[PDB]
Structure formats: structure tokens, C-alpha cells
Design a protein around this ligand. Structure first.
Ligand SMILES: NC(=O)c1ccc[n+]([C@@H]2O[C@H](COP(=O)([O-])OP(=O)(O)OC[C@H]3O[C@@H](n4cnc5c(N)ncnc54)[C@H](OP(=O)(O)O)[C@@H]3O)[C@@H](O)[C@H]2O)c1
Ligand SMILES: COc1cccc(NC(=O)c2ccccc2OCc2c(C)noc2C)c1
Length: 314
């Protein structure tokens, strides 16, 4: 069950989110990625930021060795972190990711964020006052380096993440653009449904990939605890009983029926296996409008620190 991208490649519409907080041991990412493939996941979403690409790569490698899957069956995504936006840093960053995951190519390589940060191996460079150090980079030059990564065959497709309409247009209107972004991976859920950005992306044949589709991990570092818990929403819960499903399954099915590729993170075997049941049932057009009405313009990631960044997408 895939969507054809604007470069001709195919992307499975349900993806496994691999991020876990640093308090979760790295061995779990290896275990649960195997479980995800066992359950039927084929789209696997990782990033240099996540400090798990070696474990995710080991799991893919293990499921190829036991004959469960072939490399051609797995859609693996990595992401260029914001400290490597400068063009000369892009290809070595991808090559590092490939070496850690022990893969010859990624199916998808993304610009993780438009907010460039100070170049270096430090993921969160902070000044003497503990403030994240920004960098200024022409993201069109970053994209040019991404296009060369596709030409070199190190990435089958290239796309962006956390871009707004204006930043997307910056790429689409770039003189001599060779490859359009195949996708824009953004926070998207019934409380933040991105209908405006989704309509724009559809008009440009760019796939919207939804993260925090299940309402985020509510990490204490970025999520206000008083924010609403998505999966406790009464409309989601009432729809779950109607269909004899779970609120999470409603949230995932919501995205599939509106043309959105949806990610789902779980480090729990039974919830991993439950999430692939999204293909078993179907919401009515009335159910969809009911979920459409839940929009709160609530993004679970906030930071007034990044609000000052020139490229802050919100
Ligand atoms: N490009 C970006 O900037 C960006 C940002 C954030 C995330 N992402 C990616 O998107 C992926 C998912 O987003 P997310 O990290 O915010 O997590 P999420 O998909 O919104 O899931 C949130 C929580 O829901 C739980 N869950 C999973 N299945 C469930 C089910 N059937 N019933 C009840 N609860 C369930 C999970 O807890 P359990 O683990 O206990 O099951 C999970 O922690 C991430 O892993 C990451 O790959 C990308
Ligand atoms: C070095 O640390 C940085 C620097 C910048 C941004 C972040 N972002 C986050 O911590 C984060 C945490 C949880 C969910 C989503 C998150 O960010 C999504 C996002 C948006 C929107 N724009 O860029 C990104 C990335 C972390």
C-alpha cells in the first residue's frame, strides 16, 4: 500500500517512527524495529539526530538475513541534521548515516528542519548563556547538495521536513531546480491537521508525511503537560467504539483517507502490531468531517527559543 512520488519512486503510506528519548536504551530500538518489520511495517523513519541509525540498520540487516524481507522491500528514511546545512557538509553527513546503518543507500533523505544551526559535530551547540547557536544558510544551496546525493545514487528520493509554504516555494521557484521535494514531513494530527499546507502540497504533488500523528511522546523537555492528550479526545474515543477500534487507529486512518502518509512510533510489541490494522477498516465521509472539526492549531513541539530563528516554520 504505497503512494507514487513525483520522482517515480513509491513510498508505503504507513511508516514506523523510531525516535525514543535518550533515556531509552539503544538496544530497544534494535528490538522494536525488528518487531515492526515482523508486524508488516516496511517504511522506517530514522535520522542522524535520533542516535539510533546503527540499531535500525542492524534490525533491517537481521530481517534480511533471516529471509523475512529484502532490501528492496524496505523504505528507509534518514534526515540531514541542521548542523550540516552548509552544502559541503551534506554528502559526508549522508555517507556517515549510511556507514552507521550499514546501508548502500537511503530510500529517502530529508532536510530535517529549515532552522540551520552552527556547523559541527555537536547536535545542540549552545553559547555561554545556554542558547542554541543559529547559523545562516541559503537552503537552496543545501537542496542543490541534496540533488547531487540523489544523482550519486546515495538517496533514491529527497524531500524536506518542517518546511512551511514560503520555504517550500523557495525550493520550487529555485532557478534550475532539478528535483522537487517528494515530501514534506511535518507535525500533523487531528489537533493540528495542516489542511492549508496539505492543499498546497497536493497542488504541487508533494506528499505530506505526518509525524506526532498519535499526539507525540509528550516529552517533558518540549511539551506542556497541560496540553490536551490527543488519544483521550472524546470524538476519537467515540469513533473507536463505533468501529470497534482504538483512538490511535482512528488517528492513523484519518490521515490515510485524506491523502497523508502517516508515521507511528511505538516501542510496545502489541501496539506496534495493532497499528498495522489501520488497513483493516474505513471511516465514513461523515467520520472524516467530525475529525476535521477537531483542529486546535496545537503543535506539541513548542519553543520560544526557536521562535527567534529566522527560519522558524510557525
Ligand atoms: N521530522 C521531525 O522533525 C520529526 C519530529 C518528531 C517525530 N518525527 C518522527 O515521527 C515519528 C512518530 O512521531 P512521535 O515521536 O511524536 O510519536 P507518535 O507517532 O505521535 O506516538 C505517540 C505515542 O503514542 C503511543 N502509541 C503508539 N501506538 C499506540 C497505540 N495503538 N495506542 C496507544 N498508544 C500508542 C506510543 O507510546 P508507546 O511507545 O508506549 O507505544 C507513542 O509514544 C517519530 O518517531 C519520528 O520518526 C519526526
Ligand atoms: C537541536 O535541537 C533542536 C533544534 C531545533 C528544533 C528541535 N526540535 C525538537 O526538539 C522537536 C522535538 C519534538 C518534536 C518535534 C521537534 O521539532 C520539530 C521541528 C520543527 C517544527 N522545526 O524543526 C524541527 C526539528 C530541536
Amino acid at each position: 500500500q504505497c503512494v507514487k512520488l513525483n520522482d517515480g519512486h513509491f513510498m508505503p503510506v504507513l511508516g514506523f517512527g523510531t525516535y525514543a528519548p535518550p533515556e531509552v536504551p539503544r538496544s530497544k530500538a534494535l528490538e522494536v524495529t525488528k518487531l515492526a518489520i515482523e508486524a508488516g511495517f516496511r517504511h522506517i523513519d530514522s535520522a542522524h539526530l535520533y542516535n539510533n541509525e546503527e540499531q535500525v540498520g542492524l534490525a533491517i540487516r537481521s530481517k534480511i538475513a533471516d529471509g523475512s524481507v529484502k532490501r528492496e522491500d524496505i523504505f528507509y528514511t534518514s534526515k540531514l541534521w541542521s548542523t550540516f546545512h552548509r552544502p559541503e557538509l551534506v554528502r559526508p553527513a549522508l555517507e556517515n548515516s549510511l556507514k552507521k546503518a550499514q546501508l548502500d543507500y537511503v530510500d529517502l533523505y530529508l532536510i530535517h528542519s529549515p532552522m540551520s544551526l552552527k556547523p559541527g559535530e555537536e547536535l545542540s551547540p549552545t553559547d555561554e548563556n545556554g542558547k542554541v547557536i543559529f547559523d545562516i544558510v541559503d537552503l537552496c544551496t543545501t537542496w542543490e547538495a541534496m540533488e547531487k546525493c540523489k544523482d550519486a545514487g546515495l538517496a533514491k528520493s529527497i524531500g524536506v521536513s518542517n518546511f512551511n509554504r514560503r520555504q517550500l516555494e523557495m525550493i520550487l521557484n529555485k532557478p534550475g531546480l532539478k528535483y522537487k521535494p517528494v515530501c514534506n514531513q511535518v507535525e500533523c494530527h487531528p489537533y493540528f491537521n495542516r489542511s492549508k499546507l496539505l492543499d498546497f502540497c497536493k497542488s504541487k504533488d508533494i506528499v505530506l508525511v505526518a509525524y506526532s500523528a498519535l499526539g507525540s511522546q509528550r516529552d517533558k523537555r518540549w511539551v506542556d503537560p497541560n496540553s490536551p492528550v490527543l488519544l483521550e479526545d472524546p470524538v476519537l474515543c467515540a469513533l473507536a467504539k463505533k468501529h470497534k477500534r482504538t483512538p490511535a487507529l482512528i488517528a492513523l486512518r484519518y490521515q490515510l483517507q485524506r491523502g497523508v502518509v502517516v508515521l507511528a512510533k511505538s516501542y510496545n510489541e502489541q501496539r506496534i502490531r495493532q497499528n498495522v490494522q489501520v488497513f483493516e477498516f474505513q471511516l465514513t465521509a461523515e467520520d472524516m468531517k467530525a475529525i476535521d472539526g477537531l483542529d486546535r492549531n496545537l503543535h506539541y513541539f513548542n519553543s520560544d527559543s526557536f521562535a527567534s530563528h529566522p527560519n522558524y516554520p510557525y
